[PDB]
Design a protein around this ligand. Structure first.
Ligand SMILES: Cc1cccc(OC[C@@H]2CCCC[C@@H]2C(=O)O)c1
Length: 134
């Protein structure tokens, strides 16, 4: 057993707060905000050795990242940004920093009760997205 065991599984979005404002702060345009905001993604987290994979599937877009903690990688976001990402574990929380165009956003994923809580921060704006087991 290991690092991210409590994250592994298949998860479905059950609540979202302030996501439109988070996307505005990120720079996402009107039509993508509207369509992306409707999506109820399933997130599938798995671990194989040192490699963590996070897949997201939705009506809007499917995304997939595989990574080693602390090791920067290239990512294509659901809103089609091309970012440089680094994900670490800090006190049991996955901390994901995305850098692009001189900008930065941080996404934290943590286990809380039977939920997986995702907090997305861009400058002063946070969005909270809560997932339950599928
Ligand atoms: C695949 C897809 C479709 C539409 C929205 C979306 O948001 C992802 C959220 C923001 C970016 C960080 C992760 C968040 C999460 O809910 O895991 C993803």
């Amino acid at each position: 057993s290991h690092m991210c065991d409590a994250f592994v599984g298949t998860w479905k979005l059950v609540s979202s707060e302030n996501f439109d404002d988070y996307m505005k702060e990120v720079g996402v345009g009107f039509a993508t905000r509207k369509v992306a905001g409707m999506a109820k993604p399933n997130m599938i987290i798995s671990v194989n050795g040192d490699v963590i994979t996070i897949k997201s599937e939705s009506t809007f877009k499917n995304t997939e990242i595989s990574f080693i903690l602390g090791q920067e990688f290239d990512e294509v976001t659901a809103d089609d940004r091309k970012v440089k990402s680094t994900i670490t574990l800090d006190g049991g929380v996955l901390v994901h920093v995305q850098k692009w165009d001189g900008k930065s956003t941080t996404i934290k994923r943590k286990r809380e009760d039977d939920k997986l809580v995702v907090e997305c921060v861009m400058k002063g704006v946070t969005s909270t997205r809560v997932y339950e087991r599928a």
